[PDB]
Design a protein around this motif. Structure first.
Motif, PDB file in Angstrom:
ATOM      1  N   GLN B  95       4.904  42.011 -20.436  1.00 34.80           N
ATOM      2  CA  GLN B  95       4.482  40.599 -20.589  1.00 34.80           C
ATOM      3  C   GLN B  95       3.876  40.041 -19.322  1.00 34.80           C
ATOM      4  OE1 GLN B  95       7.485  36.916 -21.083  1.00 34.80           O
ATOM      5  NE2 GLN B  95       6.845  37.653 -23.097  1.00 34.80           N
ATOM      6  N   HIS B 112      18.561  30.169 -19.511  1.00 33.14           N
ATOM      7  CA  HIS B 112      18.320  31.301 -20.434  1.00 33.14           C
ATOM      8  C   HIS B 112      18.133  32.608 -19.635  1.00 33.14           C
ATOM      9  CE1 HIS B 112      14.240  30.459 -19.218  1.00 33.14           C
ATOM     10  NE2 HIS B 112      13.812  31.551 -19.829  1.00 33.14           N
ATOM     11  N   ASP B 114      15.895  36.138 -19.762  1.00 38.29           N
ATOM     12  CA  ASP B 114      14.702  36.618 -20.356  1.00 38.29           C
ATOM     13  C   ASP B 114      14.938  37.772 -21.340  1.00 38.29           C
ATOM     14  OD1 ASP B 114      12.944  34.907 -18.899  1.00 38.29           O
ATOM     15  OD2 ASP B 114      12.599  36.366 -17.286  1.00 38.29           O
ATOM     16  N   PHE B 117      15.317  37.453 -25.279  1.00 36.97           N
ATOM     17  CA  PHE B 117      14.136  37.373 -26.080  1.00 36.97           C
ATOM     18  C   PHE B 117      13.555  38.738 -26.288  1.00 36.97           C
ATOM     19  CE2 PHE B 117      13.176  32.770 -25.744  1.00 36.97           C
ATOM     20  CZ  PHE B 117      14.100  32.419 -24.752  1.00 36.97           C
ATOM     21  N   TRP B 118      13.475  39.506 -25.220  1.00 35.55           N
ATOM     22  CA  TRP B 118      12.757  40.753 -25.333  1.00 35.55           C
ATOM     23  C   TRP B 118      13.523  41.759 -26.212  1.00 35.55           C
ATOM     24  CZ3 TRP B 118      12.114  40.606 -19.256  1.00 35.55           C
ATOM     25  CH2 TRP B 118      11.143  39.603 -18.975  1.00 35.55           C
ATOM     26  N   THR B 170       9.809  30.382 -28.538  1.00 37.32           N
ATOM     27  CA  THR B 170      10.072  31.243 -27.365  1.00 37.32           C
ATOM     28  C   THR B 170       9.311  30.890 -26.070  1.00 37.32           C
ATOM     29  OG1 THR B 170       8.355  32.940 -28.063  1.00 37.32           O
ATOM     30  CG2 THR B 170      10.731  33.267 -28.853  1.00 37.32           C
ATOM     31  N   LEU B 171       8.273  30.074 -26.219  1.00 37.93           N
ATOM     32  CA  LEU B 171       7.369  29.683 -25.123  1.00 37.93           C
ATOM     33  C   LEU B 171       7.481  28.163 -24.780  1.00 37.93           C
ATOM     34  CD1 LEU B 171       4.249  31.543 -26.495  1.00 37.93           C
ATOM     35  CD2 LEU B 171       6.078  32.382 -24.989  1.00 37.93           C
ATOM     36  N   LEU B 175      13.737  26.132 -26.250  1.00 29.07           N
ATOM     37  CA  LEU B 175      13.763  27.600 -26.321  1.00 29.07           C
ATOM     38  C   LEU B 175      14.669  28.115 -27.396  1.00 29.07           C
ATOM     39  CD1 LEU B 175      14.153  28.769 -22.635  1.00 29.07           C
ATOM     40  CD2 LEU B 175      12.182  29.084 -24.135  1.00 29.07           C
ATOM     41  N   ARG B 244       5.986  40.292 -32.396  1.00 30.83           N
ATOM     42  CA  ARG B 244       5.098  39.391 -31.667  1.00 30.83           C
ATOM     43  C   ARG B 244       3.794  40.096 -31.337  1.00 30.83           C
ATOM     44  NH1 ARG B 244       8.387  35.939 -27.240  1.00 30.83           N
ATOM     45  NH2 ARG B 244       8.726  38.044 -26.301  1.00 30.83           N
TER      46      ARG B 244
HETATM   47  O1  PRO Z   1       9.568  34.550 -24.921  1.00 31.22           O
HETATM   48  C1  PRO Z   1       9.503  35.247 -23.907  1.00 31.22           C
HETATM   49  O2  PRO Z   1       9.291  36.478 -24.035  1.00 31.22           O
HETATM   50  C2  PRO Z   1       9.658  34.546 -22.580  1.00 31.22           C
HETATM   51  C3  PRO Z   1      10.947  34.928 -21.919  1.00 31.22           C
HETATM   52  C4  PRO Z   1      11.696  33.643 -21.472  1.00 31.22           C
HETATM   53  C5  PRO Z   1      10.955  32.543 -22.185  1.00 31.22           C
HETATM   54  N1  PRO Z   1       9.781  33.071 -22.711  1.00 31.22           N
END
Ligand code: PRO
Ligand code: PRO
Ligand SMILES: [O]
Ligand SMILES: [O]
Ligand SMILES: [O]
Ligand SMILES: [O]
Lengths: 264, 264
Positions: B95, B112, B114, B117-118, B170-171, B175, B244
């Protein structure tokens, strides 16, 4: 009561140069607890004097007029002599408020100078006033500390964006008198930014004309402040230009004397 | 190109203990300017890859797939060897995003990790990944720095409040995976909070599993970050659980090699 407290000459110079000064550990834990309990009672019972942020209680005003504890507090030998020292006068309380920022809560508070409100809304003729903010909780980098421009008060009062009719929006973020932006930039280019920190029980003195702001508490810990605004008696507000109730802008200008020790 | 850069053993230990590490002044001013110009072009032309805060542009994603400058940047001898050192593997880019916080603007970004999400959105099997955040501007106390819990990554992934369907959220602040509150309190009681600072051109490395958050920029100065997420090749995401597009979660797992010097 301990021989009245005063600021050393270094502390004074620092206050006058910067516009703010922290004294650590003025009040002890037990003292602070007494103050937080009373703050909680005032938030419960203050009615129209309370302010709420989509929110629970943010501020309460005027408490020293209604609470015997807080009426004593403003006369404390820890506070009143320093107020008299810094204002070079007998003093009285213009304004008293309690501002909480609960853990993970809070707002951005727009940059502003307290004296702009007091001059225009209350008739304060000069900025010969200051505020004492008692830390009900440790103030850190992360729970929305008051943030200043060091030396920023030396501008005097700064021409300011006005928004609103009457005074409702003097107690909110969003604020009636804010400093928008070239203003801030040059200020900060010239002077920088400092968020004074300190343990629970500290006191932060700041000038009526210092610019200040704060952000949200992203900590899991609260940031409660009890803010007492002392004004010089000679600088008493002109009550004929006054627009706000007694619990925002005092009208009894009797000089304050210190609490003395009694057996009760 | 200078002999590939690596972290000293103290720097490594610090990174692994804390979960983050700053290297100051990795890129010079002229280099940073080249990167900001390109960031501005990507914000102009990125279309559906852009994200906007009532707002102008906040984020843009996937830029190393579209920009030759940014495709080079991820292979830089200043970055790639350290990624390889910390992940103990060949690496690729999972990313890439650019997150601006303009002067007097910004949001509270919920706490949060990271990797949550991944793992859940992209199929990352383990947290053997990290992010390099290049400071396009000096990061201070006042322009919304990334804020961590030091050592917080050692929890592994932390059970998390989910909000929303698909990935749109997610962005955003707000969140999809956030850490609500006893969680944070104990974390922070145990570990504290640190917002690493640094000059323009620094690099902040941080662990895929470190908790982090940031507040608004009340400064008159911007906070632009270019964030490159390197993943271990052995840790390649399982593209069969992937939800995604390529510009959020890469699918070309070719090991990266460093830029070499050429006459053009
Ligand atoms: O969605 C993602 O991949 C990133 C990670 C933290 C917030 N946004
Ligand atoms: O309205 C007042 O009097 C105070 C001063 C700064 C903001 N509120
Ligand atoms: O203020
Ligand atoms: O204030
Ligand atoms: O993040
Ligand atoms: O992120």
């Amino acid at each position: 009561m301990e021989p009245h407290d005063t600021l050393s000459p270094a502390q004074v110079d620092e206050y006058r140069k910067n516009g703010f000064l922290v004294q650590e550990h003025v009040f002890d834990e037990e003292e602070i607890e007494l103050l937080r309990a009373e703050a909680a009672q005032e938030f419960a019972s203050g009615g129209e004097r309370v302010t709420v942020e989509t929110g629970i209680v943010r501020g309460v005003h005027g408490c020293h007029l209604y609470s015997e504890v807080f009426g004593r507090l403003v006369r404390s030998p820890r506070l009143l002599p320093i107020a008299r020292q810094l204002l070079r006068d007998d003093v009285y309380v213009h304004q008293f408020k309690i501002n909480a920022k609960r853990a993970f809560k809070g707002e951005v508070w727009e940059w502003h100078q307290d004296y702009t409100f007091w001059h225009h809304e209350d008739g304060m003729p000069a900025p010969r006033a200051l505020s004492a903010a008692i830390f009900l909780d440790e103030v850190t980098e992360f729970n929305g500390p008051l943030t200043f421009v060091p030396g920023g008060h030396g501008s005097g009062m700064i021409d300011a964006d006005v928004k609103g009719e009457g005074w409702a929006n003097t107690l909110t973020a969003s604020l009636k008198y804010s400093l928008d932006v070239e203003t801030m930039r040059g200020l900060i280019e010239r002077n920088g930014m400092v968020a004074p920190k300190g343990p629970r029980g500290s006191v932060l003195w700041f000038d009526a004309n210092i610019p200040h702001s704060s952000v949200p508490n992203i900590s899991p810990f609260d940031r409660g402040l009890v803010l007492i605004t002392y004004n010089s008696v000679e600088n008493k507000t002109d009550v004929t230009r006054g627009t706000r109730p007694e619990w925002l802008a005092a009208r009894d200008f009797t000089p304050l004397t210190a609490l003395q020790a009694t057996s009760f």
